[PDB]
């Protein structure tokens, strides 16, 4: 779509918009109101999914602050949708009954797939991405984090599986190191202290 | 002998620190870790996993 690949990303953010008395829902509603005002005017950390969400918030905040604060208007619309992405990730930051955020998660992952289609096939379809770094970067970044969210969320994952994988890799390298030592450097029957003297 | 007896009753901690702790559990692990990291190449296996 050339310069309307940005309109495709805008449609992705509109899909992100598709997805009570506590302060968190008030914060989400305030962020959505800020998205509405910006769009009409410009024209916790202890889980891996939380890491991706925080990252998304940070990146997309820098994105809005690098494009909107700093078919030409699609370059501002696709960056205005980054605040909707940040609102969705701050909603999922407390993922609070999970059934409230389940549909938000489904819309988030579906439009992350749509952005990871549009922006990924954008260079091969004619348009160029390398031109504007501070504009073009954060949408690719949030699409990446969105996809790895649909991988770290869909399968439970958590820090437990990360620690288990790190321990398995270190354990296999440990047995390789012990075999290498006992076979080439010094036999463990020579290195250790023979008891029963 | 009286002064040695008095000083041996006074100290009672520094002697264990200097006879058990100071080399084997304070200085020698530091020395071997620093020596290994100074010796082995800048490799993930040799710098983290093998030590």
């Amino acid at each position: 779509p050339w310069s309307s690949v940005l309109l495709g990303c805008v449609a992705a953010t509109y899909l992100r918009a598709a997805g009570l008395l506590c302060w968190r829902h008030q914060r989400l509603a305030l962020t959505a109101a800020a998205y509405g005002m910006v769009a009409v005017l410009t024209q916790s950390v202890s889980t891996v999914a939380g890491l991706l969400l925080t990252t998304t918030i940070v990146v997309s905040l820098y994105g809005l602050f690098a494009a909107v604060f700093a078919a030409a208007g699609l370059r501002r619309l696709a960056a205005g949708g980054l605040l909707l992405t940040a609102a969705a990730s701050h909603g999922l930051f407390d993922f609070p009954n999970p059934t409230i955020y389940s549909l938000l998660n489904l819309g988030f992952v579906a439009a992350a797939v749509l952005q990871s289609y549009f922006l990924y096939i954008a260079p091969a379809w004619g348009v160029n991405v390398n031109w504007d770094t501070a504009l073009w970067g954060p949408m690719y970044g949030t699409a990446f984090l969105g996809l790895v969210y649909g991988l770290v969320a869909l399968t439970k994952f958590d820090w437990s599986s990360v620690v288990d994988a790190v321990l398995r890799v270190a354990c296999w390298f440990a047995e390789l190191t012990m075999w290498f030592w006992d076979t080439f450097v010094w036999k463990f029957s020579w290195s250790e202290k023979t008891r029963r003297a | 002998g009286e002064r040695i007896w008095a000083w041996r009753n006074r100290s009672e901690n520094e002697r264990w620190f200097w006879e058990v702790f100071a080399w084997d559990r304070l200085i020698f692990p530091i020395l071997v870790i620093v020596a290994w990291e100074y010796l082995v190449p800048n490799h993930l296996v040799w710098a983290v996993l093998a030590p």
């Binding site: 202290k193 | 559990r25 304070l26 020698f28 020395l31 020596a35």
Partner: peptide, 25 residues
């Protein structure tokens, strides 16, 4: 928790850790 932030002796099992000192020196 209930233990101190102190090392463990490496000469309780092998003398091989003593090989690093002269080689590094």
């Amino acid at each position: 928790n209930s233990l101190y932030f102190v090392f463990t002796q490496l000469n309780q099992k092998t003398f091989l850790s003593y090989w690093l000192l002269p080689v590094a020196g």
